[PDB]
Design a protein around this ligand. Structure first.
Ligand SMILES: O=C(O)C1=C(C(=O)Nc2sc3c(c2-c2nc(C4CC4)no2)CCCC3)CCOC1
Length: 130
């Protein structure tokens, strides 16, 4: 939809702090910190796919809005995830071990803006079309 495309990361703020707040170790935060992934969003029928592609690691999720799914994250958490569309924003929550984190994806002008929150840490990542 408004989201469908191939997106390339152009800016990131507070991502190391976000990863730290989630308990991610040094080696994975080192891989994530200066990675500039592509995010490939597609839709077919009920099913949305989001691929995150980067030199040292690729991940993918496919889901139906409102339907919880199991996800293995890039930092190897086993989480339960639910994604909904609220006011044009794709809102993802991941739940594990009594914890939660949100990843919100929105379109603003030419940007795909991704806000990641864990506790008191807010990270913002900005993608532009490839
Ligand atoms: O911008 C995005 O799509 C988002 C995320 C993302 O790109 N994460 C990447 S790309 C990447 C790596 C990680 C990574 N994340 C984590 C923890 C934070 C979750 N540990 O490693 C590690 C291996 C190299 C490539 C995560 C938050 O949701 C939005």
């Amino acid at each position: 939809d408004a989201f469908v495309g191939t997106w390339k990361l152009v800016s990131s703020e507070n991502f190391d702090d976000y990863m730290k707040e989630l308990g991610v170790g040094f080696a994975t935060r080192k891989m994530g910190g200066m990675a500039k992934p592509n995010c490939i969003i597609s839709v077919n029928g009920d099913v949305i796919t989001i691929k995150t592609e980067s030199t040292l690691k690729n991940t993918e999720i496919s889901f139906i809005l409102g339907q919880e799914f199991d996800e293995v994250t890039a930092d190897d958490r086993k989480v339960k995830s639910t994604i909904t569309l609220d006011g044009g924003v794709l809102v993802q929550v991941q739940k594990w071990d009594g914890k939660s984190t949100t990843i919100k994806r929105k379109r603003e002008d030419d940007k795909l803006v991704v806000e990641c929150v864990m506790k008191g840490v807010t990270c913002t990542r900005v993608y532009e079309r490839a």
